[PDB]
Automatic annotation (TrEMBL), chains A, F:
This is Anti-sigma factor antagonist. The gene is mlaB. It holds the Pfam family STAS_2. The lineage of its organism: Bacteria, Pseudomonadati, Pseudomonadota, Gammaproteobacteria, Moraxellales. Residues 9-85 form the MlaB-like STAS domain. InterPro entries: MlaB-like_STAS, STAS_dom_sf.
UniProtKB/TrEMBL annotation, chains B, D:
The complex is composed of two ATP-binding proteins (MlaF), two transmembrane proteins (MlaE), two cytoplasmic solute-binding proteins (MlaB) and six periplasmic solute-binding proteins (MlaD). The gene is mlaE. It comes from Acinetobacter baumannii. This is Intermembrane phospholipid transport system permease protein MlaE. It comes from the Bacteria. Keywords: Cell inner membrane, Cell membrane, Membrane, Transmembrane, Transmembrane helix, Transport. It holds the Pfam family MlaE.
Automatic annotation (TrEMBL), chains C, E:
It comes from Acinetobacter baumannii. It comes from the Bacteria. Keywords: ATP-binding, Nucleotide-binding, Transport. The lineage of its organism: Bacteria, Pseudomonadati, Pseudomonadota, Gammaproteobacteria, Moraxellales. This is ABC transporter ATP-binding protein. Residues 5-241 form the ABC transporter domain. ATP 1 binds at R14, G40, T41, K43, T44. PANTHER family: INTERMEMBRANE PHOSPHOLIPID TRANSPORT SYSTEM ATP-BINDING PROTEIN MLAF, PROTEIN TRIGALACTOSYLDIACYLGLYCEROL 3, CHLOROPLASTIC. The keyword Oxidoreductase does not apply. SUPFAM superfamilies: P-loop containing nucleoside triphosphate hydrolases. The gene is ttg2A. ADP binds at R17, S39, K43, S142. CDD domains: ABC_Org_Solvent_Resistant (cd03261). It holds the Pfam family ABC_tran. ATP 2 binds at R14, R17, G40, T44.
């Protein structure tokens, strides 16, 4: 529902179909105040990632310069299962 | 310039489609009949003709009640309605009963033949009949064509007879005109060989076109459950255009 | 494991005809449950009674306490967001494109912008394996790609109940081989709960974990596919093997022969 | 006594079939429209209306060439053919253009809706749409009904305008009557509110019946590839009987 | 064993489309010959080119010396008395009874009295196992009895060539079990020569004796079902197993997933 | 094509679709001159029995006393294969 920045933006709560419009855009403004791409994600407070949470996550990467102005870490044992199903782990720095 | 290219490709396939349907008609009628060919023609006269008897007799009455009610409202201002029995039986015999009874035959018994021969093509009954050796044009198609050329001129007469009797009901018995001047106005102005025979020859040319189209569309389908239903609207449209098209050509010759 | 759908003693009559006189089913969570039987019985009407489109007459459909028919119009519209359905022929909407087919359950339920819907369709059509086709109509689509699009439409909300209805009925062994992996893969990565209605004994014994066999209105046998063949009732034993001995017969009439005179 | 028992069983099912189609109409029109309902009505006006534009404009010309050629052959014996422009524009405006343009709309765009909603019922698109939660009456059926009530009264005017212009071609420019007495015979005898408006109200009652029947037959099919094609002849027959049936009732009221 | 039908290098084009560019087949006498392949190719048009209804364009169909197309109208009517055909959907004649269906190939070819025709139909409908039904129309006939009547019609002249066309396409394992015995039984007792077009690898490897696999216009492999799996071409090996590696692919296009921008 | 009598009617030649109308009736007149049913068949000169030859054979049994007056012997290794296919060897004295 909410996400903070600090130094590493962490996504917390649940992302499902009636909180995904402000949560996508609250993180979108974060990217443009942060240059030289250290914005690596440590998403771990997610509990019910259900492929829409992947959909807002790739859309943050779409704006980022080049095509990898970030990195993802500490996946909640289930979001990465979604990633191999869409064959996306040649495209996300999951390590 | 693709839309012009698609439009020119549309009417070239529709021209070629006429040439296949012309060669299909010369194979049916230029053949002496196979043994057993009259037993199927009597049965196919039941499906095409007798089932169409209810719609034509009822709808023929409803036009007669309209022609008697509209012809009285116009002929009462000029005060000459001894010509009411003439203009009712002259509108039907030469003009409406050849035309309207072909617009209801194209719907009820015209499109039903295209579903009947069409569903035999998707369910492979036509292809199975040929491997036995039986030719499906002579077996299936040809008793349906000859039951269409016969059953429509027998139906425009029942349309015209019920339309005049219905027009006699609202003219004489409800609006109150003279009964004797109704009938005696007919025999003066309505000849037989110029009006009743020319209303029958007009329906034989109409019965050929509403049946040769409605048979060819159900024989040259594309075998698909939604390709059949697209060829049942192709045969109501094309019949109603050739009825009204050959109307003006036959009217200009007969009454010009 | 807990049950998700508990069917408890219903009856459905389409006009002096008995379908499912008395029958009780259990759909355990996360577990592939197959329903087999002879053709003509109400197999694909059972999926419509589970899904809540046709109405029962003497029973209830239990979705975690709640009856289906007792739901309001704003809960039944919410409960149908937790269900998918892949039909017999891949019932696509032919008057609209592939991208409009997959986005149809998203736009009917949820209110999102176009830059998130067009990403979610590009993730659903990727997980099936049809990412490059997002603009063409569902004609010029091959028969092997027709059912795969309709799988992406039924899965486009992440439900917990997706009911396949004969997913391989007269298909090539290649296209049967692709679809039998996507039923295994997409279930296991999304925590689904599948229902396969089919009559194909080789795969259905080797893809299911609990098999119901309904024959004329009741259960002929149930259980894991070990004990289904070990507790073989005389109708199930003929069904799974295709034998010529049992309660369903070969001959039409047993009137000797010379007792008919062909006149 | 089985045939009388089968006949009584036939018209009881056809009576309760009316009651289902009446309750289906009260669910469509008694509802405020869903979001996006105008974008589909503009598209469904293309399929029903604009595709039907070619058959009506061409067939409307062929009746005008017949009405000018038949009305001249009768009005030349009585020697009064300054009333030629009246009887051509009086046959079309109150009688033929409401009726014939509904007998061609039932064929072309009437039966096409029954194939369109009918093929959605056998291929389970209607059942699949409901489990998502979308109600198929509001989504699929209701933009087709409102595109039928609008598109037919826009088509009888194009039928009546092309029919008079076609009748002016063979009357004035080919048979040789006076052009000024052709048009000035119209404005004396042909009012607007009694004739042109009463020819439009007659087609709104016709557009309701040729569309509510043609939608109900494609919604209450039996899902079968040869059960669809039997419901496309049920909707051409039932439309042509209710057009000619409500003809006499509306004529007796308006011109009695 | 001698060949009955020798197809030798034909081509069939239904309008700038290639079906069977160059292909040569052998139908050995008394031996079950199967033809398999992916759906959409001209499989059931090959049975029509063998049976002589559609015309070849660059080849010949050899029935013991004689070409099919070079036959007169009184030899081709005689050669079609030596052929049977069970179609895809059991193409019965719905406007006439069961007794009129089976007697239709007898009355079209031969001239016999009614007391011998009504005996021959009672022997043909007996050998299938439907001797009590001789008066009802082919509606109120079940789907399992629909194909069995159409087998009796195709066999009602004792031919030497009966070509089944997917005899079990989406049927119950009981009705599949009945029909797989009648293909074995009626062939062996009448010296037939069957052709089974199908795509069902378990029975087709265990009911046929020589299998042709056609894929896009040529043969991918042939032989007895021992050496078909031993000489496995990279397309036949994927076909008989349903694997995910070979010349027919899983994915639609290959653009990673970032080279598209969903706009 | 032809069949004799002597004391035991023997069927010879071929029975196929253009000789089966006189061959059925030539044997039918034989039955009514022969009382106390010794008319046992020793059909052995048949070479191409093709189920029509069974069809004329059962029809001789139809118009006989009771329902069984003929017994069949020495089947040409192929006609009896037809008989089990129609399940008729509870109905023909083949022994
Ligand atoms: N619209 C209908 N009206 C009346 N009876 C119907 C209708 N639809 C189906 N039935 C009958 O109800 C029964 C339901 O069986 P149904 O065909 O739905 O299951 P099925 O054979 O398994 O279907 P599928 O093979 O498509 O899964 C059938 O015997 C059918 O005859
Ligand atoms: N009437 C037709 N007009 C044009 N093309 C056709 C027609 N019928 C078939 N075709 C095309 O020719 C090809 C022939 O393949 P066909 O469908 O006959 O074999 P099949 O798929 O094995 O059939 P079945 O599955 O019924 O045995 C198909 O790809 C089809 O698209």
């Amino acid at each position: 529902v909410v996400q903070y920045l600090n130094q590493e933006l962490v996504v917390s709560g649940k992302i499902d179909f009636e909180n995904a419009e402000q949560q996508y855009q609250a993180g979108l403004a974060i990217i443009k105040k942060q240059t030289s791409f250290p914005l690596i994600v440590d998403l771990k407070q997610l509990e019910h990632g259900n492929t829409l949470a992947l959909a807002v996550l790739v859309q943050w990467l779409r704006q980022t310069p080049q095509k990898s102005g970030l990195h993802f870490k500490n996946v909640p044992e289930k979001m990465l299962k979604i990633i191999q199903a869409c064959h996306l782990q040649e495209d996300l720095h999951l390590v | 310039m693709n839309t012009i290219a698609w439009l020119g490709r549309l009417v070239i396939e529709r021209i070629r489609g006429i040439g296949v349907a012309a060669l299909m008609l010369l194979q049916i009628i230029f053949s002496l009949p196979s043994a057993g060919g009259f037993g199927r023609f009597v049965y196919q006269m039941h499906r095409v003709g007798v089932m169409s008897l209810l719609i034509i007799t009822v709808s023929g009455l409803f036009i007669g009640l309209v022609l008697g009610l509209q012809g009285y409202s116009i002929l009462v201002n000029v005060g000459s309605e001894s010509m009411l029995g003439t203009m009712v039986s002259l509108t039907l015999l030469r003009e409406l009963a050849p035309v309207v009874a072909a617009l209801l035959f194209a719907g009820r018994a015209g499109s039903a033949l295209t579903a009947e021969i069409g569903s035999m093509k998707q369910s492979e009954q036509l292809a199975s009949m040929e491997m036995i050796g039986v030719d499906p044009l002579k077996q299936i198609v040809s008793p349906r064509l000859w039951a269409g050329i016969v059953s429509l001129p027998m139906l425009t007469v029942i349309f015209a007879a019920i339309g005049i009797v219905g027009g006699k009901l609202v003219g004489v018995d409800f609006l109150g005109v003279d009964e004797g001047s109704f009938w005696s106005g007919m025999q003066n102005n309505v000849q037989f060989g110029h009006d009743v025979v020319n209303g029958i020859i007009k329906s034989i040319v109409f019965a050929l076109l509403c049946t040769w189209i409605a048979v060819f569309q159900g024989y040259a389908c594309d075998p698909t459950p939604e390709g059949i239903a697209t060829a049942m609207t192709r045969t109501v449209v094309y019949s109603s255009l050739c009825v009204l098209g050959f109307d003006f050509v036959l009217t200009a010759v007969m009454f010009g | 494991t807990q049950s998700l759908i508990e069917v408890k003693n219903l009856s459905f009559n389409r006009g002096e005809r008995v379908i499912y006189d008395n029958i009780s089913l259990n759909i355990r969570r996360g577990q592939i449950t197959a329903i087999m039987g002879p053709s003509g019985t109400g197999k694909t009407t059972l999926l419509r009674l589970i899904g809540g489109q046709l109405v029962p007459d003497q029973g209830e459909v239990l979705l975690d306490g709640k009856d289906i028919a007792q739901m309001s119009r704003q809960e039944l519209f919410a409960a149908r967001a937790r269900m998918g359905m892949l039909f017999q022929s891949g019932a696509l909407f032919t008057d609209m494109s592939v991208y409009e087919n997959v986005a149809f359950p998203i736009r009917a339920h949820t209110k999102l912008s176009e830059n998130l819907i067009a990403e979610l369709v590009a993730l659903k059509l990727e997980s099936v394996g049809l990412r490059g086709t997002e603009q063409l109509m569902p004609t010029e689509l091959s028969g092997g790609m027709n059912r795969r699009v309709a799988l992406a439409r039924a899965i486009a909300l992440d439900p917990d109940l997706i009911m396949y209805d004969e997913p391989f009925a007269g298909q090539d062994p290649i296209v049967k081989g692709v679809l039998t992996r996507l039923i295994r893969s997409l279930r296991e990565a999304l925590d689904l709960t599948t229902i396969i209605v089919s009559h194909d004994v080789p795969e259905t014994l080797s893809i299911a974990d609990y098999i119901y066999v309904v024959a004329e209105g009741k259960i002929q046998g149930e259980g894991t596919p070990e004990e289904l063949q070990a507790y073989a009732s005389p109708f199930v034993k003929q069904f799974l093997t295709g034998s010529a001995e049992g309660p369903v017969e070969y001959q039409f009439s047993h009137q000797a022969y010379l007792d008919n005179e062909v006149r």
